Design a protein around this ligand. Sequence first.
Ligand code: HEM
Ligand code: HEM
Ligand code: AT2
Ligand code: AT2
Ligand code: H4B
Ligand code: H4B
Ligand code: ZN
Lengths: 421, 421
Amino acid sequence: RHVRIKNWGSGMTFQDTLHHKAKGILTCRSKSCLGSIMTPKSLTRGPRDKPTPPDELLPQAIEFVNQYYGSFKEAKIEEHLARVEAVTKEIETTGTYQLTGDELIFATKQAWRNAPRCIGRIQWSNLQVFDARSCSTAREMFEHICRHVRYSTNNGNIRSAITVFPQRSDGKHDFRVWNAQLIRYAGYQMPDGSIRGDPANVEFTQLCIDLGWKPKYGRFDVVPLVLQANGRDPELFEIPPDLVLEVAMEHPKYEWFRELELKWYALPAVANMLLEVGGLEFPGCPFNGWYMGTEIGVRDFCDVQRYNILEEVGRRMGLETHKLASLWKDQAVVEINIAVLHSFQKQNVTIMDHHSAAESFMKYMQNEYRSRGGCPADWIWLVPPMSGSITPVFHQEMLNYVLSPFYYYQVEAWKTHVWQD
Amino acid sequence: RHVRIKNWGSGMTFQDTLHHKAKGILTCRSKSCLGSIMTPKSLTRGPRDKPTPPDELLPQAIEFVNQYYGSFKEAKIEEHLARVEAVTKEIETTGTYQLTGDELIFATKQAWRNAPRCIGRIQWSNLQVFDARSCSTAREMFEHICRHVRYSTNNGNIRSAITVFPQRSDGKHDFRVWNAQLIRYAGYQMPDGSIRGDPANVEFTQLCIDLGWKPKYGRFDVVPLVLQANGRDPELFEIPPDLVLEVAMEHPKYEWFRELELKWYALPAVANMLLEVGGLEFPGCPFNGWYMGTEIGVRDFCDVQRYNILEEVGRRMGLETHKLASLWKDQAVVEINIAVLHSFQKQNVTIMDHHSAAESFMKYMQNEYRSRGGCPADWIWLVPPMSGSITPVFHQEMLNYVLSPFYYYQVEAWKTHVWQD
Ligand code: HEM
Ligand code: HEM
Ligand SMILES: CCOC(=O)N1CCC(Nc2cc(C)ccn2)CC1
Ligand SMILES: CCOC(=O)N1CCC(Nc2cc(C)ccn2)CC1
Ligand SMILES: C[C@H](O)[C@H](O)[C@@H]1CNc2nc(N)[nH]c(=O)c2N1
Ligand SMILES: C[C@H](O)[C@H](O)[C@H]1CNc2nc(N)[nH]c(=O)c2N1
Ligand SMILES: [Zn+2]
């Protein structure tokens, strides 16, 4: 009836029953396990050129309404029954339906709660929701986004929020933001063959240039927002500088560290995912939380395909960077990460270290099993990129599965966009 | 016809077709992925009470023979034909078959090559095979094991080897080593409830005591070998102290490190797995390689359920152990691991750091794809437990699947053994 889950670090067990409600979209079979694929198509939700048949939609809608009313501490049969009725008639007389403000709030929080790859879910109930479903132009989208950025940045005391643009209709009037993130630095391929800035963003930066943006050829240039309104061709908008809070990096001991002249933005915001709820699809729903130190210290600064600064920090510390077995790399990554946490704290900007994040997630996980007999979780994304087994999550067996509402991936907009002009 | 595999660090791609030959036995469904389960039933070959029926044996046996002869650089069709006949008649006139000497060698190396959770596979063709299939008593087992240990230790210049005991017959005459490993330290529960030694080895040490072993209540006492021959009750044998090479731990910069008085054995040997080949089952086949440093530094020394010395080392270093955010745990694990590598090196005992291991695995995986369009790999076990994303394997997408020959887990012998005396 269930799958038994064990934590080898404490001996604790959990019984997972919630997985039975999961959708059958994972590409794993008895023949092979595909769990480690980065962007599996099973987690992606591509474009459409026609509306969702009322046929397929009605069940999901009812299913969602039931999920929503069931969550109430006290049944409300009348309201529940009446809502089930309203939704049915609406789907028949219009071909789709509209969620109420309260249902949208519930949905965005539940989709977060159902995100397997997110270690910060213990905060799932503290989420600000900006209802931008009546948005109609690209410039209006830009204004909602600036409001979101200002609200969440909050002078360094970061707050989580999501802005929801209009739901998908026939799939030809999609409202979305092409950028993978709201704030991101440019990457440029220089005339001399070198790469300046974030090497993983060269392709998108080039797209911006081709759309008219003026490359500033700097190391930390914030790219503009490429906004798509009502299925129209995308329009560029630059975020005002005063809204982009940045933290300059320093090390509490190595004074030469500031000489590297490094910095990073304080707001981590995913802008290109799709919210699925009761059969409804929202292709435009940027959301943000706050940073976990290792995202910047380990991935952005130390990935070879990113800023790749590990060797330089190594030399400056005076390590034997010619001998792998000296573990100079491991010593350097810890110092770089210490600098990230120190710099954020020094400037009073919210950030979280990976130990604290791992611990809070274990608490969250335990509450989810006692509250709903399950917690979808993707071990591969939850274990931090450094000091894995030193954290409690490493020793925790987990089940990964897709529920609904859910945040899905999408295919980059520029790959499937049919340019009108 | 093929799954595309990608390395996000180098952008390189792989096309996997080998997974088609895989045995459909993983518990992963379309509704939920069970990739992070430690010891799944799908990778466990339990006991038997009756010989294996030829309807299953014959097909598998032909498969193996076909696989073995296919592996030849210059086909030998006649011999291949002869073998198929011989094996068929043999299975007919006796009910089972015997592998030849070279088929056994081939089988052990292929099973290693097929081990998804082993990062040291680049050395797969370099394996000493001790053929102990004509063994009949527990005492002979002991002597075969001492020879194996002496050969493999080789005064610090560790060599890989496997010792193969008699194949399973009716499942009531199993030849096996009850110990999880050939060399392991005891764990004692004291009268007050506290634990002395390896707390993860408390149950097995108690079993040894109940069978007659005199406890020494030390922190690093090597437990005796519990050996079962021909399905009989197990016999205890203590490994001669001179055959157990140990490395005393020291730190290159911290003189106080030696005051912790820590050491570890040089030979990592798995002794409780089952080798499956052509339908045949070998429940007794201890094998060894050489250590990867993180195994001792991170897992044995820093796991909270193991020796758990992290906090003590942090204090000695004078770190702020009251603040998770100072990342003292990360600084301390690095120092402990530097000590492990330094100590082995100083005593001239083969050991391998996790960076070199990771790099060699990438080479091996590349060759595997060029050789057979596949490489079963379990991401979760291959990424080292510290500095994960700083190694190339973290960025490599992988497919996990079960081939044949293969090394399976077994149910602990003491849980299923029916005592005669
Ligand atoms: C409150 C602070 C939060 C923290 C500390 C946190 C932390 C994280 C981290 C570290 C990741 C891994 C990112 C990566 O490796 O690329 C992640 C992923 C994710 N988070 Fe959270 N998160 C927070 C808030 C949120 C919010 C507000 C939502 C949605 C309402 C959310 C939805 C997700 C999703 C769907 C992913 C997966 C992104 C992907 O697969 O590319 N998170 N989060
Ligand atoms: C020569 C050097 C070798 C190295 C450095 C190496 C390294 C490793 C490591 C680091 C693990 C993970 C162990 C754990 O996390 O518990 C492992 C597992 C394993 N190794 Fe290798 N190994 C070597 C040789 C061998 C040989 C000779 C065989 C087989 C004949 C082998 C078979 C396996 C198997 C089957 C596992 C999985 C064990 C389990 O699931 O408990 N290894 N090895
Ligand atoms: C490579 C560029 O990466 C990024 O811009 N980011 C890294 C990936 C992603 N991280 C996040 C997202 C959220 C919502 C909360 C915490 N962390 C968004 C920020
Ligand atoms: C907790 C006790 O752990 C162990 O005795 N070991 C850890 C797990 C296992 N490691 C290995 C095995 C081999 C064959 C090669 C390298 N490393 C065998 C040794
Ligand atoms: C729960 C999870 O399966 C377990 O804690 C881990 C993960 N990674 C591992 N990988 C290795 N090399 N060795 C292990 O024992 C484990 N165990
Ligand atoms: C290849 C591998 O699956 C991939 O690089 C992963 C692993 N774990 C991850 N986990 C997180 N949190 N974020 C990531 O992008 C990745 N990338
Ligand atoms: Zn799977």
